[PDB]
Write a protein that binds this DNA or RNA. Structure first.
Ligand SMILES: [K+]
Ligand SMILES: [K+]
Ligand SMILES: [K+]
Ligand SMILES: [Mg+2]
Ligand SMILES: [Mg+2]
Ligand SMILES: [Mg+2]
Ligand SMILES: [Mg+2]
Ligand SMILES: [Mg+2]
Length: 191
RNA sequence: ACAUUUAACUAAAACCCCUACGCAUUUAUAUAGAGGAGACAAGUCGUAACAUGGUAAGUGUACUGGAAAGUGCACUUGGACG
């Protein structure tokens, strides 16, 4: 995380683009001169933008730093963007039992309702040789439990020289979900 | 409930009842279906225990969880400890 707080007296860079407490642009200056300003005016230094090639810092009072920090947290509460997508993964075997596959299927379902990405790998079993098409059946069994709740993010693909298949499942987009409801309703009208 | 009559110059003859057992009660077997234990065997998913077993283990109790188990409270050492 990046916090809106006083950077301190030790500034990372040597050349610093500085602004005034009122926003007046003071231009670029050396960090040694900035520390002298912070002491002469009794002000603290915050980092407003780092993307700019010349590092941009602004002088601010403790009261201002508080108001901005309060402002920002009122925006994020109003607009809490879910930034990270978490890639959960399950390595399965071809000879997995039904009780174990039913347990791992329920686990996959809970990951999809949380809007995660589920990478499913299926590997050849111990003492067992299987047709690569048979391994692909498990993917369709897992997804069949989630008819209108999930779909192939990446379709089944052979990996490790064909020894083990791979896949990625995802939650259906809102548009794809309304389409499924529509198609399902049309079938209801037909029947 | 039943009630002793005839007979008696030797003495004997009459005497003969009916109510229970069932839709009760006792015990057991058979049968729809649902579970447990053990044996064989070692497939499936984890690695809970045994080493400080990789979060020391366990007792009681509570809650929770695919599963061993996890966590809380007290207790035990059948653990450790300048
Ligand atoms: K344990
Ligand atoms: K132990
Ligand atoms: K206990
Ligand atoms: Mg990861
Ligand atoms: Mg263990
Ligand atoms: Mg342990
Ligand atoms: Mg305990
Ligand atoms: Mg818990």
């Amino acid at each position: 995380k990046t916090a809106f707080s006083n950077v301190g007296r030790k500034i990372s860079q040597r050349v610093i683009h500085l602004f005034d407490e009122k926003g007046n642009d003071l231009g670029n200056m050396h960090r040694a001169n900035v520390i002298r300003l912070m002491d002469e005016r009794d002000l603290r230094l915050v980092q407003r933008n780092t993307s700019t090639e010349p590092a941009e810092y602004q002088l601010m009072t403790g009261l201002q730093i508080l108001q901005e920090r309060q402002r920002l947290r009122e925006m994020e509460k109003a607009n809490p963007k879910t930034g990270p997508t978490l890639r959960k993964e399950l390595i399965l075997s071809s000879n997995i039992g039904q009780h174990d596959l039913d347990t791992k299927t329920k686990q996959i379902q809970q990951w999809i309702k949380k809007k995660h990405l589920v990478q499913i790998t299926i590997k050849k079993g111990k003492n067992v040789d299987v047709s690569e098409n048979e391994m692909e059946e498990i993917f369709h069994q897992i997804l069949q439990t989630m008819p209108g709740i999930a779909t192939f993010s990446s379709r089944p693909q052979a990996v490790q020289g064909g020894k083990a298949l791979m896949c990625v499942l995802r939650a259906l987009s809102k548009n794809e979900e309304k389409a499924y409801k529509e198609t399902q309703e049309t079938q209801e009208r037909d029947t």
